[PDB]
Structures are given as C-alpha cells and as structure tokens.
Design a protein around this ligand. Sequence first.
Ligand code: M2H
Ligand code: CA
Lengths: 226, 213
Amino acid sequence: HLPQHVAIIMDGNNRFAKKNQMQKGDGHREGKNVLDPIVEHCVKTGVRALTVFAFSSENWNRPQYEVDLLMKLLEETIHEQIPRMKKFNIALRFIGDRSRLPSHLVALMEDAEQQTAHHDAMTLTIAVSYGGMWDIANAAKQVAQAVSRGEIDADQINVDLFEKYVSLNDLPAVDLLIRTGGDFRISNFLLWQAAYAELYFTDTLWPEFTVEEFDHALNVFSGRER
Amino acid sequence: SEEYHLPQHVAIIMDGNNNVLDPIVEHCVKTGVRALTVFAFSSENWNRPQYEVDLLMKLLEETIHEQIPRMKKFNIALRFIGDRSRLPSHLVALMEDAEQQTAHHDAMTLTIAVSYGGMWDIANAAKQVAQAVSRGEIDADQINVDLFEKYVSLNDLPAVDLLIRTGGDFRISNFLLWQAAYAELYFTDTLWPEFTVEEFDHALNVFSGRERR
Ligand SMILES: Cc1cc(C)c(C#N)[nH]1
Ligand SMILES: [Ca+2]
C-alpha cells in the first residue's frame, strides 16, 4: 500500500554548497530543481498529496540575505510550476502565515492556487512562512472567533472539532514524513498532521536526493523494501 | 565541541512490551537532567479489549503506589498528563495524592503520560483558551503562539530536547507533538523491558555531541 500523503523536510542545501565548493546560496539554487522529478514520480505512482517544507517560521531569523534569496527563489519556483501544474493536473496550494510574506509574492500565490484549484490528480502543497506551532495557534484563534460569534459552545471543543481548523484538514493525514540532510528532528513542521506518520531519515543532502531513494522510502512504507 | 551539554528535558516512548524506569530516573538525578516525561498509556490504548484496559489500570495503580516512597526519598516531583475523565475514580484520587505530596520537590520532575495524546493535549489547550474568551478574560484576536503555548501541558518545564523511542519503529505516535517540535530524536531496536542505563547514557551523549550514532 502506497502512502496517501507524503511530507518532505528538504534539508542539506547549505552543507551541499560547502562540500561541492559552490557560491553562497547555490545549494538552494540546485535544491529547487530536485523537486520536479519527485513531483512527477508522485503523480505517475498515484500519491494523492505531497507537502514540502520550503520556508519555516524559524527561517525568518536566518541571515537576511538568505531570507531575500529564499523569497526570490520562491517567486521563481511558483512561476516555473504554474505551467507544470496545468500539464500534470496538479492542484497547487500554500500553507503558512501570509502576513509575514512580500505582498507581490502573496498575489502570485493566490493566482497559482486559484488557477489550479480544479486540478484533481494530486495536491502539491508548499509550506511558506509555516510552522506547526503557528498552524495550531492559528486554528485555536479561528475556533475562539467562532465562539465569539456564538456559533460554537467552548465546552464542546474537542479533537474532532479542532481538526477542522488546522491546515490541510481536507487532505488525508501525513502517513510518511521524509527528512534529508542527516538530522533526526521534526523541526516544527506538520506537528498535528503527522501525529501518526512513519518516518524516513537519510544522510542524503537535499540537492543530491534522487527519485530512486524517494521510491525506496515509498517501498519502505509499503513493505516492498526492508 | 569543547562543551558537552546534556538535554534539559528527555521524553521516552516505552515501546516493545508486547522496573526499567527506576535506574533511568536515578541517572537523570545523577547527570542533572531536570525533567523526564514517559508515555505510559495513550488515547489509542482505550480502543483495546476491556480485560487489557483493566490489567493496565491495575499496573498503573501498582506503579504509582511503588513510586510514591521513591519520589519522597529522592525529592522528585511526580506529575501526570492526559485526560482524567476516562479513568477510574480511585486511580484519579491516587494520582492527585502523588502529585500533591510531591509538587514542591525540586531534584527533578518525572511526568507520566496517562490516557494521553498530543492531539488531545492541543485541543484541550484550544478549549481552555476559548473558555477564557467566552468569560471575557481575553479577546480572540490576542491568540498567537506565545499565548497558546501557556495552555499546552508541561509549558513550565524546558521544551523536550531529546525524545527516545524504543521498540525499533521509526514513527510518530501522537506523543508530545507541541513540546518535542525541536527535539533531537533517538530511535533504537532495543525493546523497552531490555532498555539499559548504559544505552540511556549513550542517547544523552549523542545529544551532547560527546558520542556519535
Ligand atoms: C514531535 C515528535 C516526534 C516523535 C517521534 C513524536 C512522537 N510520538 N513526536
Ligand atoms: Ca476581537
């Protein structure tokens, strides 16, 4: 059995830049291109959802030049992906705190989501200015606003009600979470959504990650591979 | 790597079962680990047959009674997290006695997660925040990570910085989702009944960087 929803923490970009004696942020540039063969593998295999950790709540405290580079790379990625989403019938979504993002980038994100919302072969979600803690607290805020409008009785808040307010609630739960780069950490990613996820950790750095290893991780989840 | 700092708060998923804890608790006190949180009984464990649930309730009662004299001798604080509404009345009264007799103890904090789930914990926090909004204590617009985190269990203790999972599975099982958001993860094939203080110490040293995986 194939995982219904795969999530990826794409770590090891800066380490790849130092190892291959590359320029500043070249690992992020090489890293952005690794996603296309994996997205195509997902749609051809039948994976219904893929969620990638592109920019965390914590990444806002990285050196400002890295933040600027990541915003430019996200803008470039969205433009490049829109025709690919249309070609492969993939719905493109974004999760995260949009208040912290550049206004023009939010406009581009809105366009991409709107133009691909009717696509149904797979859902590709890019987590931008995202953190599991932010997501959970935002869901708590929306539940409390509903209490304030008199729509919900606070005494009736439970797991089943709360789950409707967390990001990607209309998608299946994350059943496989991959982390490249060699670190054994969830790093504030999909905390709620990945509550029961199987985990796949690898020393392979993100710009070196292949479809063969991604497929191996899928087969480790199924039981096809050891 | 000149300074080797041990984790301030260790959490353990005690898997592989289908007394080990006592020397691990003593090792935390010896090495300066401030808190140890262990996953005893999950939300998911209520879905097991009634005779199994009854046996688990007996084991929990036995364990609490046996631990109270140790908590007093070593001056350790004993706490419990999880949904108490589902538990028997005499067990809840026992949990209350143990936590009240030891609440002021400062050597370390031992927390036992009973009828616990990370999702339950988070939704419980959302409920209390919403109740504060309904009573006019706060406006819903003030709800952010900084306010919300106060309502998540164990927020007065350091964040979980090391999470050990015995039993060989590489998976998340609805245990300290919020609290272990940045924790280093230690996975081992060792089954919980066979887990040693030597291996527990190895995990502490993998965290500090004194030893490698
Ligand atoms: C945050 C987190 C990591 C793991 C392995 C768990 C559990 N259960 N929670
Ligand atoms: Ca208001």
